[PDB]
Amino acid sequence: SHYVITLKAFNNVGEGIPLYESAVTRPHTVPDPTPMMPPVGVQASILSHDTIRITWADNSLPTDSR
Amino acid sequence: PDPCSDENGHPRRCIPDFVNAAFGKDVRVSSTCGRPPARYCVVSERGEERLRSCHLCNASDPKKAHPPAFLTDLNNPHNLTCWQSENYLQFPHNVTLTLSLGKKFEVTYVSLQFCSPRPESMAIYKSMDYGRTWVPFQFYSTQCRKMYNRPHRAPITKQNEQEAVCTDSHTDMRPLSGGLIAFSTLDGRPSAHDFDNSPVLQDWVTATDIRVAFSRLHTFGDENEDDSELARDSYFYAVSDLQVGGRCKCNGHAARCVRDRDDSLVCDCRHNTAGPECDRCKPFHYDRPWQRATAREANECVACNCNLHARRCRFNMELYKLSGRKSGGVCLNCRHNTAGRHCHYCKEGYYRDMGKPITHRKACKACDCHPVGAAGKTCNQTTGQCPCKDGVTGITCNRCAKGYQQSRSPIAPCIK
Amino acid sequence: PDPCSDENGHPRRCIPDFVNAAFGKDVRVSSTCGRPPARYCVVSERGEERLRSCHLCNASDPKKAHPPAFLTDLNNPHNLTCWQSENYLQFPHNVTLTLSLGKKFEVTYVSLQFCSPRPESMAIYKSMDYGRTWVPFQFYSTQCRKMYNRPHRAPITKQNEQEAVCTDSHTDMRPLSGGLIAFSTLDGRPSAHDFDNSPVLQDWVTATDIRVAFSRLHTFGDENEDDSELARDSYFYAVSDLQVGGRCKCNGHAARCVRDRDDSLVCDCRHNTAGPECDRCKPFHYDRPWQRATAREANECVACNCNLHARRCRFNMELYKLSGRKSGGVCLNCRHNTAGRHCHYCKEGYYRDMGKPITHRKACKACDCHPVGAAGKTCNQTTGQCPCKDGVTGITCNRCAKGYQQSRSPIAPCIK
Ligand SMILES: *[C@@H]1O[C@H](CO)[C@@H](O)[C@H](O)[C@H]1NC(C)=O
Ligand SMILES: *[C@@H]1O[C@H](CO)[C@@H](O)[C@H](O)[C@H]1NC(C)=O
Ligand SMILES: *[C@@H]1O[C@H](CO)[C@@H](O)[C@H](O)[C@H]1NC(C)=O
Ligand SMILES: *[C@@H]1O[C@H](CO)[C@@H](O)[C@H](O)[C@H]1NC(C)=O
Ligand SMILES: *[C@@H]1O[C@H](CO)[C@@H](O)[C@H](O)[C@H]1NC(C)=O
Ligand SMILES: *[C@@H]1O[C@H](CO)[C@@H](O)[C@H](O)[C@H]1NC(C)=O
Ligand SMILES: [Ca+2]
Numbered sequence: 002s003h004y005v006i007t008l009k010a011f012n013n014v015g016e017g018i019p020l021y022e023s024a025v026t027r028p029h030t031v032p033d034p035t036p037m038m039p040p041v042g043v044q045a046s047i048l049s050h051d052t053i054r055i056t057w058a059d060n061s062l063p064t065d066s067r
Numbered sequence: 068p069d070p071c072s073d074e075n076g077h078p079r080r081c082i083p084d085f086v087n088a089a090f091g092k093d094v095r096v097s098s099t100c101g102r103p104p105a106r107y108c109v110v111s112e113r114g115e116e117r118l119r120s121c122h123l124c125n126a127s128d129p130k131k132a133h134p135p136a137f138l139t140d141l142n143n144p145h146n147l148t149c150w151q152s153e154n155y156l157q158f159p160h161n162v163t164l165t166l167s168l169g170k171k172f173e174v175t176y177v178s179l180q181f182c183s184p185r186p187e188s189m190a191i192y193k194s195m196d197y198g199r200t201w202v203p204f205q206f207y208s209t210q211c212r213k214m215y216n217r218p219h220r221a222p223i224t225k226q227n228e229q230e231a232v233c234t235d236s237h238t239d240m241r242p243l244s245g246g247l248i249a250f251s252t253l254d255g256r257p258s259a260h261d262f263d264n265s266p267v268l269q270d271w272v273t274a275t276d277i278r279v280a281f282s283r284l285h286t287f288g289d290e291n292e293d294d295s296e297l298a299r300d301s302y303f304y305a306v307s308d309l310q311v312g313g314r315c316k317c318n319g320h321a322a323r324c325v326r327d328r329d330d331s332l333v334c335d336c337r338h339n340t341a342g343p344e345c346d347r348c349k350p351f352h353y354d355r356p357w358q359r360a361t362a363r364e365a366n367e368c369v370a371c372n373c374n375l376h377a378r379r380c381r382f383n384m385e386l387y388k389l390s391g392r393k394s395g396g397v398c399l400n401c402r403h404n405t406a407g408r409h410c411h412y413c414k415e416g417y418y419r420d421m422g423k424p425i426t427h428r429k430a431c432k433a434c435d436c437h438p439v440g441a442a443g444k445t446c447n448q449t450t451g452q453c454p455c456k457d458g459v460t461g462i463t464c465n466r467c468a469k470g471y472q473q474s475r476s477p478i479a480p481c482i483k
Numbered sequence: 484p485d486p487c488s489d490e491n492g493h494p495r496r497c498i499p500d501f502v503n504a505a506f507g508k509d510v511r512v513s514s515t516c517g518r519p520p521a522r523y524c525v526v527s528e529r530g531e532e533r534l535r536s537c538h539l540c541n542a543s544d545p546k547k548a549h550p551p552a553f554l555t556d557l558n559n560p561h562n563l564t565c566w567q568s569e570n571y572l573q574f575p576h577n578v579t580l581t582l583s584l585g586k587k588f589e590v591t592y593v594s595l596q597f598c599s600p601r602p603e604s605m606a607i608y609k610s611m612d613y614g615r616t617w618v619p620f621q622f623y624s625t626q627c628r629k630m631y632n633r634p635h636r637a638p639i640t641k642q643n644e645q646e647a648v649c650t651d652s653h654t655d656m657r658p659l660s661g662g663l664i665a666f667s668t669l670d671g672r673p674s675a676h677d678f679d680n681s682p683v684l685q686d687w688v689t690a691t692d693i694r695v696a697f698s699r700l701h702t703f704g705d706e707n708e709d710d711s712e713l714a715r716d717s718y719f720y721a722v723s724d725l726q727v728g729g730r731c732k733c734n735g736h737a738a739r740c741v742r743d744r745d746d747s748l749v750c751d752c753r754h755n756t757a758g759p760e761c762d763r764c765k766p767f768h769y770d771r772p773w774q775r776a777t778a779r780e781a782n783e784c785v786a787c788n789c790n791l792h793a794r795r796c797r798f799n800m801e802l803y804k805l806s807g808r809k810s811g812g813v814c815l816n817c818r819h820n821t822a823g824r825h826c827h828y829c830k831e832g833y834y835r836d837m838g839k840p841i842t843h844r845k846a847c848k849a850c851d852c853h854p855v856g857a858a859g860k861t862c863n864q865t866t867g868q869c870p871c872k873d874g875v876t877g878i879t880c881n882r883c884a885k886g887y888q889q890s891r892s893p894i895a896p897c898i899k
């Protein structure tokens with residue numbers, strides 16, 4: 002957020018002439034989620050001139066929407 | 068001492084201090100009580116009952132008057148001073164307040180502290196030109212549709228952030244005294260977070276004059292009763308404090324705004340720039356296209372280099388494109404027989420002196436090619452040899468070769 | 484124009500001008516005639532006879548008054564102005580004069596010009612703090628032993644030059660008017676010749692306040708006679724001129740003392756120093772330990788170098804010792820992923836870009852080592868090669884080698 006700060010000098014008779022200044026507060030840091038393990042055993046199997054089938058495995062797999 | 072200079076002395080973004088631009092400035096209003104002197108009544112609510120205290124507004128008496136100067140004067144909570152409009156100026160009739168800054172200001176807020184209850188309908192207007200045309204800034208009403216032809220509680224669209232929005236917020240009759248309406252210019256605007264890179268919102272905050280129009284006032288519905296005088300005298304617009312906060316628009320190239328020779332408020336431009344808002348660039352500094360200053364990059368105006376041979380330089384877009392967005396400043400009318408954007412070169416009928424550099428005044432010696440000896444006037448630039456005809460041995464083609472005798476023919480000057 | 488700068492602009496020892504620090508300053512005294520107004524008698528000796536002229540001291544009348552302001556005012560031989568103590572304030576009773584400079588001054592002398600005869604017993608006192616504790620400076624008496632518990636005519640010892648000494652010098656009743664007592668702070672002190680290198684005497688000359696106490700006055704012995712009034716009225720302490728000479732203590736780093744924001748006398752420190760007496764060093768200048776300036780060596784405070792990556796630096800004694808008394812400034816909390824007292828370096832999980840120097844922002848590129856391919860995260864700094872497992876050909880260990888196929892095992896990613 003962008004705040005506007007005002008400073009006044011006051012006594013018993015009242016408040017004096019103000020002095021203005023503005024500042025933008027620094028954004029809160031957000032921790033990044035820890036990453037997952039990438040797939041293993043990635044093998045390319047050439048079938049034709051325009052088709053190649055890719056096969057991979059996952060060590061994390063012992064349900065999920067991954 | 069200078070804020071524009073870094074610790075080493077490198078250029079950095081310059082911003083003028085945040086100021087209430089309204090303070091001590093003359094405001095033109097449509098109505099003021101006292102001419103002729105009329106009675107006004109203050110309404111006060113306590114519990115379930117309403118109380119009225121009637122006073123007189125006399126423009127001549129300083130303690131009884133409420134002039135427009137009471138809007139812009141110092142706000143003191145101990146001794147409040149407010150301006151007061153003429154009694155019962157209800158819709159269609161309106162009460163307007165025009166404020167002229169006389170310069171482009173990047174407005175952050177427009178606030179109003181009321182002595183009387185806040186209006187049912189109020190609108191904030193701005194002027195890009197110095198008062199010619201008016202563009203709405205913000206609307207406040209119970210019926211945005213019926214009053215100001217705008218949607219009620221409309222969310223800020225990314226498609227048009229340069230549009231004034233209407234809300235029923237801050238319009239409540241309570242508090243009947245001390246009510247505040249403060250308009251945040253960058254409130255709700257989706258790209259406000261990246262303001263420095265958003266020219267759309269940079270233009271939105273810009274205003275030279277501010278006009279606040281009070282269209283409809285809050286009423287209890289007792290004005291149409293048997294006694295109209297007592298009721299209608301207790302409805303009026305009164306404001307104690309008017310604050311237009313924001314910094315002087317200097318596009319990040321000035322730390323302060325100073326009054327010039329014609330008594331006009333202008334930025335004290337830096338980073339080799341000129342203009343009322345530092346929008347353009349100082350003469351002989353057209354080496355780079357003008358760009359507004361950001362937090363990370365100073366965006367200073369780059370000086371031309373003509374090696375003290377030209378007084379005027381021009382910007383070339385094609386050359387700036389060919390340089391890979393580096394430099395595009397080409398010098399105009401190069402003096403001392405020089406050429407190129409660099410402005411150092413030699414000419415025909417002339418040859419370069421190897422003893423002195425190209426930057427020197429006597430860089431090109433005269434090539435005195437004989438009119439009957441030499442074929443052409445243009446010679447060899449590195450050695451200084453004229454194009455001789457009939458194999459003439461002369462440096463400037465002045466002497467016939469061995470065995471050759473001088474001839475009468477202009478085609479054959481030497482004959483073997 | 485600046486005395487701190489040399490002809491080329493190199494640093495040199497700065498000394499404030501020699502001033503009478505007492506001049507025009509308020510002095511608090513214990514007694515003054517006129518309240519109530521009393522009679523005083525001036526004694527004058529001519530030949531073998533004594534003569535007395537009695538006058539009146541009236542505090543209200545300007546021509547008859549002798550206020551403490553008459554000590555510090557301009558000394559005029561044509562029109563002398565002296566302060567006068569209350570009549571007959573003989574031992575044990577004393578008359579003291581406290582002078583507050585409000586700053587550390589390197590005192591060269593303390594002088595007193597008397598209107599009445601000089602005292603039989605007088606003492607000069609100084610204050611290191613601003614008046615809390617008092618340390619003796621010099622004693623003057625006929626009986627140093629009996630009066631001030633100090634040896635009479637004691638020679639200045641090399642073992643303790645910071646000790647006040649007592650003498651019977653300058654105590655003589657003659658002259659009965661115009662008698663002078665001037666105390667030389669560095670008189671007789673054995674190491675005074677090498678003052679610049681002697682901190683013991685540098686501390687001795689230092690004082691913030693000066694107090695002179697008149698303990699016993701000279702008498703003829705006629706006060707105890709039949710008529711006490713006439714006799715006792717002719718014995719009093721009177722001083723026309725009080726001079727405290729010396730330069731402002733700025734340890735050779737300032738040419739003048741200026742009053743600050745709180746109206747306090749402070750040195751205008753130079754050579755990258757700060758402090759009331761230039762005793763400490765300006766922030767970010769802790770590259771060398773603080774040292775007082777001498778005639779041959781300027782002894783300037785050396786600036787830290789963090790290559791614009793750190794705002795705060797600290798002094799390390801061990802590093803200063805390891806450098807051979809050259810430099811000992813180590814930068815604190817190095818920014819932009821740098822290390823070292825120099826503050827330029829690279830980190831693990833990262834490698835150096837050879838195209839740009841170490842001082843550049845983008846000096847270290849990210850080392851994106853594959854989590855299943857590479858063995859470790861830390862790579863080769865000069866080439867940018869991750870520690871590959873099973874002979875992986877990839878730069879970041881991303882592709883299997885020739886003949887090798889990708890495997891399910893986390894230990895063996897590629898199998899032949
Ligand atoms: C107050 O109003 C009356 C209206 O007739 C006017 O005559 C008078 O001058 C005003 N008071 C002062 C102090 O001017
Ligand atoms: C105090 O308020 C009254 C209100 O009428 C005004 O006339 C007066 O000038 C104010 N004084 C100051 C110093 O603001
Ligand atoms: C206010 O009244 C004036 C006429 O007095 C009119 O021109 C204007 O449109 C009205 N409305 C606003 C919002 O100013
Ligand atoms: C001198 O002293 C007397 C003491 O009674 C006093 O009344 C008088 O005012 C003094 N003289 C002057 C000029 O004040
Ligand atoms: C001259 O001396 C008398 C002594 O009482 C003093 O009152 C007066 O102020 C002196 N004048 C100057 C100019 O010093
Ligand atoms: C002077 O008298 C005071 C008391 O009035 C006493 O404190 C002090 O010790 C005496 N001696 C000196 C040298 O000040
Ligand atoms: Ca006010």
Ligand SMILES: [Ca+2]
Binds near residue numbers: 557558559564565
């Ligand atoms: Ca004097």
